[PDB]
UniProtKB/Swiss-Prot annotation:
Listed name of the protein: Chymotrypsin-like elastase family member 1
Family classification: Belongs to the peptidase S1 family. Elastase subfamily.
Residues the record marks as active site: H45, D93, S188
Cofactor note: Binds 1 Ca(2+) ion per subunit.
Amino-acid positions noted as binding Ca(2+) in the UniProt annotation, renumbered to this chain: E59, N61, Q64, E69
Length: 240
């Protein structure tokens, strides 16, 4: 997250860190959202590589013991069947991960609430992106979980020619694009939290930014629109 602030450690208890095994260690690669005690929602592109993955819930500082973490292996990966890795602009950038164990819920570990199917945010709706991604274009990962305020940009504006044009689809949410705050590499797969009727819900799964940089004016961060995938999500969990 570029232009973020450090999150309080109990603000976003559904945020997870998706990590892969790297030699004798583990490395953060993506975010995700805990949606059941044994299921995580992330981006499909995060799990393209044939790596060994684990999820960390209750994580705040990637580089220090928080005293709150639970580490669980990924047992099954279900990518959206229409996902195509060399065409992120087509959409379907979503995957579900079944965890090897069910995690224990507490003030640091909670299920993300998802929007009702079909919900579309009005333009300029208040949302936060969260994650441990790069803090500058071509920079380095954050140590501590970051948040940035990214108001939505509706489809009509986002798909206009000076924004993303044809690359953005109605199955996506755009947010930000002010040139200061944005998602960045390592935030993919994580949540966009939007306040609706008094309650935060996870409306987006972080999908892509511009090849020109993370924080680029009129290139808002683009997210998979979770409310377009409610039936898919429920069908996968019910059949696994
Ligand atoms: Na930690």
């Amino acid at each position: 997250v570029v232009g973020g602030t450090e999150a309080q450690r109990n603000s976003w208890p559904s945020q997870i860190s998706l990590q892969y095994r790297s030699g004798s260690s583990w490395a953060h690669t993506c975010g995700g959202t805990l949606i059941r005690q044994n299921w995580v929602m992330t981006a499909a592109h995060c799990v393209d590589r044939e790596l060994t993955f684990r999820v960390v819930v209750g994580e705040h500082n990637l580089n220090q013991n928080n005293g709150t973490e639970q580490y669980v292996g990924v047992q099954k990966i279900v990518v959206h069947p229409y996902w195509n890795t060399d065409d992120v602009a087509a959409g379907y950038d979503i995957a579900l991960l079944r965890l090897a164990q069910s995690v224990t819920l507490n003030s640091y570990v909670q299920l993300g609430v998802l929007p009702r199917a079909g919900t579309i945010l009005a333009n300029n709706s208040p949302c936060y992106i969260t994650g441990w991604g790069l803090t500058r274009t071509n920079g380095q990962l954050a140590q501590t979980l970051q948040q940035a305020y990214l108001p939505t940009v509706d489809y009509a504006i986002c798909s206009s020619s000076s924004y993303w044009g044809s690359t953005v689809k109605n199955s996506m949410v755009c947010a930000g694009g002010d040139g200061v705050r944005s998602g960045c590499q390592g935030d993919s797969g994580g949540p966009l939290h939007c306040l609706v009727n008094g309650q935060y819900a996870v409306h987006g799964v972080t999908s892509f930014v511009s090849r020109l940089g993370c924080n680029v004016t009129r290139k808002p961060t683009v997210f998979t629109r979770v409310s377009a995938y409610i039936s898919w999500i429920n069908n996968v969990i019910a059949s696994n």
